[PDB]
């Protein structure tokens, strides 16, 4: 009962890794698809909804097309080096939240591994 | 009495899970593909949810 | 095989209103994203919009938003292009990209001419 | 990330920025080492909070310091297929494979169980060990502490009610082998001879299939000796209530438990008040122990046993203090029968005990025991007490009657507790102690009844 246990255990592992693998490839290819406008702002949104209070932003000069809009709503826009993140840096003082599409990438077995593996298996 | 009693269940215990081992390994394979045909729908799903 | 029909171009006054269908067969149509790009005769190809599997997710061109609105029928395998406020520079060949693998064009449809005039 | 530290000393830190965090809240941290630890949000303040890192800071500079909020409550991935798989106080499995995915995600802070949803229980079981099964009847959903010194074993002992755990089939005029039955194991603090002494007598048991293991060994955080409990507990629930099997748990180094309670009673705001020991000491004790309970409309049961380890042998120490208390009937080792070579060494004339005739000894539990436990007691005692008046009065003084009374306390004990290895029924238990209850002729054998003695002649 051992033996089949681990068996598919290491099966099973290897279909969740590799639904991370296929949802990487969407990013490296998320600015490429045209939804990456609507992608951009959600993220700055919340970063300034929350607790700081804008005092900078920071995002890459390539995702400034996309982010001229909350230019002028807070602050301004200066690199991650991601293309894949909007940092806030808030005026309490630091503070600093970081909304980036890896870390949510990475927590999405951190907080709704029983969603994804329901639909995959039952 | 003891020499003849160890032999005759020794001989079972590995043939026992030998077969087990058959039947594991192709439901490990039996997991996979029911998955990788609704692949692209865990996808979608993971998508829509990173993106707040 | 990957079979993708264009329909509903044709002539519109400028202002004025149309929407192209696509319907699709030879795939599981409602596991994948899906495109709308336009060629005018004579010049390039522009995509104009994409929308994700399950629908939950759209994304427009700067020449179109607020104007176009893609939409899909998972039931019947149709994708859907609404078109309101057309002008000239609309009049294009519209191709349905049918079907994107995550982004990219996988397959093309046979396109519908739209003329504004 | 959050960086502006205020306090940081041992696995209680404070950093500012803060007021976005809730009471019991999963947040990670950077550090100097170059290592992301854990945080519990334990306490929250007006521009600062309380943190508590499930691990031990030996490097964190004031340059690099974070704090991102994780989730809101603070929780554990638990699902039903997670039988046979070892685990450690971090929550990671030991066994070297992906980590499970959950079907819930339960809080690791516990709900407790209300008093309504339980009624008596009084399906009792054998636990290979006599005395017990006789004396105070171990049932499902009952505590039972067993008190151990320090200087004497604690290991040994534990061992014997897990590979001799077992419930009657008939015996008690039904069974509950219908249902699977499986164990559960968390220890708290273990060194290098206690890690694999337990698991290679979970081979005895030949369950390591069917088990759930917690272990947390010194080697390992000391922030993570009273995380681990609850957390454990919470993987009792899940599959006792909810998927209707009757899960044993067993806890053992509840010293070692109230090492690291004691870390945080004076480290912390909080003052000690229980005797040089905090106050918020008897909620860390209840929250443990109140979940547990066969509850009525569960087939179901989660049966604690806690092993204690507390010490020397003083009563006033916290530990034995308010784990006296909580429990209803308690059994205790001492060192007058570990002198002798008997194991166990269970000891019962200090020993008390508040449930044997209370929905046990009558009811489903059979009541052929029922005037037999009445009367071992005032027996044993005749014995154990004398044998101290004896150096008084003389040094070999005793009368006609008195002699009677030494006669049976050598026998009862020799015999009767020396099980270990050697498993008894109801049956082969109360047929053999009437037996040295003959050598106390009728006036001392009042309580037993005039069916009782001929019943079990």
């Known amino acids: 009962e051992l033996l089949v246990a681990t068996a598919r255990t290491q099966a099973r592992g290897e279909v969740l890794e590799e639904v991370r693998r296929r949802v990487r490839e969407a990013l490296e290819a998320l600015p490429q698809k045209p939804e990456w406008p609507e992608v951009v702002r959600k993220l700055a949104l919340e970063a300034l909804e929350a607790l700081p209070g804008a005092k900078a932003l920071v995002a890459n000069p390539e995702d400034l097309p996309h982010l001229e809009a909350m230019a002028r709503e807070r602050g301004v826009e200066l690199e991650p080096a991601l293309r894949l993140g909007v940092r806030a840096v808030g005026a309490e003082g630091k503070t600093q939240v970081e909304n980036s599409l890896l870390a949510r990438m990475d927590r999405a077995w951190d907080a709704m591994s029983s969603k994804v593996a329901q639909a995959l298996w039952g | 009495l003891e020499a003849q009693y160890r032999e005759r269940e020794r001989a079972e215990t590995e043939a026992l899970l030998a077969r087990y081992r058959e039947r594991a390994e192709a439901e490990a394979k039996a997991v996979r593909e029911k998955a990788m045909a609704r692949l692209d729908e865990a996808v979608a799903l993971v998508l829509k949810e990173v993106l707040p | 095989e990957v079979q993708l029909l264009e329909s509903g171009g044709g002539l519109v006054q400028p202002g004025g209103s149309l929407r192209l269908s696509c319907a699709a067969s030879?795939?599981?149509?409602?596991?994948?994203?899906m495109s709308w790009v336009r060629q005018a005769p004579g010049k390039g190809l522009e995509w104009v919009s994409s929308?994700?599997?399950?629908?939950?997710?759209?994304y427009y061109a700067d020449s179109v938003k607020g104007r176009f609105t893609i939409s899909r029928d998972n039931s019947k395998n149709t994708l859907y292009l609404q078109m309101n406020s057309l002008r000239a520079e609309d009049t294009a060949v519209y191709y349905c990209?049918?079907?994107?693998?995550?982004?990219?064009?996988?397959?093309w449809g046979q396109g519908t001419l739209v003329t504004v005039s | 990330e959050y960086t502006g530290i205020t306090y940081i000393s041992g696995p209680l830190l404070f950093v500012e920025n803060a007021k976005d965090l809730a009471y019991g809240a999963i947040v990670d941290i950077k550090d100097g080492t170059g290592r992301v630890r854990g945080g519990q949000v334990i306490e929250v303040s007006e521009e600062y909070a309380v943190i508590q890192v499930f691990e031990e800071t030996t490097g964190l500079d004031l340059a690099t310091t974070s704090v991102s909020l994780v989730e809101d409550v603070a929780r554990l991935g638990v699902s039903k297929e997670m039988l046979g798989r070892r685990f450690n106080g971090i929550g990671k499995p030991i066994d070297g494979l992906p980590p499970i995915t959950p079907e819930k995600r339960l809080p690791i802070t516990g709900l407790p169980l209300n008093p309504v949803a339980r009624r008596k229980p009084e399906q009792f079981i054998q636990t290979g060990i006599s005395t017990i099964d006789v004396m105070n009847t171990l049932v499902r959903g009952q505590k039972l502490p067993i008190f151990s010194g320090s200087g004497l074993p604690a290991n040994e002992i534990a061992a014997q009610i897990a590979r001799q755990a077992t419930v009657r089939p008939d015996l008690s005029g039904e069974g509950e082998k219908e249902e699977p039955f499986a164990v559960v194991f968390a220890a708290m603090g273990i060194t290098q001879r206690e890690l694999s002494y337990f698991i290679q007598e979970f081979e005895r048991t030949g369950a390591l299939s069917r088990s759930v293991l917690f272990l947390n060994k010194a080697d390992d955080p000391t922030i993570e000796r009273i995380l681990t409990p609850r957390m454990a507990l919470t993987v009792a629930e899940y599959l006792a209530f909810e998927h209707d099997y009757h899960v044993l748990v067993i806890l053992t180094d509840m010293t070692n438990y109230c090492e690291a309670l004691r870390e945080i009673g004076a480290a912390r705001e909080e003052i000690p008040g229980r005797r040089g020991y905090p106050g918020y000491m008897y909620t860390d004790l209840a929250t443990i122990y109140e979940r547990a309970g066969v509850v009525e409309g569960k087939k179901g049961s989660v049966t604690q046993i806690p092993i204690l380890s507390m010490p020397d042998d003083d009563r006033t120490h916290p530990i034995p203090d308010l784990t006296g208390y909580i429990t209803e009937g308690q059994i205790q080792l001492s060192r007058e029968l570990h002198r002798k070579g008997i194991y166990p060494p269970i000891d019962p004339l200090p020993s008390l005990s508040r449930l044997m005739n209370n929905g046990v000894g009558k009811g489903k539990t059979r009541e052929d025991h029922k005037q037999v436990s009445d009367q071992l007691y005032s027996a044993y005692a005749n014995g154990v007490d004398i044998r101290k008046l004896v150096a008084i009065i003389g040094e070999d003084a005793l009368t006609e009657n008195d002699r009677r009374y030494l006669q049976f306390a050598d026998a009862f004990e020799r015999f009767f507790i020396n099980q270990g290895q050697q498993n008894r029924s109801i049956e082969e238990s109360l047929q053999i102690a009437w037996a040295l209850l003959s050598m106390l002729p009728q006036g001392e054998l009042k309580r037993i009844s005039k069916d009782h003695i001929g019943k079990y002649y």
């Open positions: 929308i994700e599997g399950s629908g939950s997710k759209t």
């Open positions: 030879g795939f599981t149509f409602s596991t994948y994203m």
């Open positions: 990209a049918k079907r994107d693998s995550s982004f990219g064009f996988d397959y």
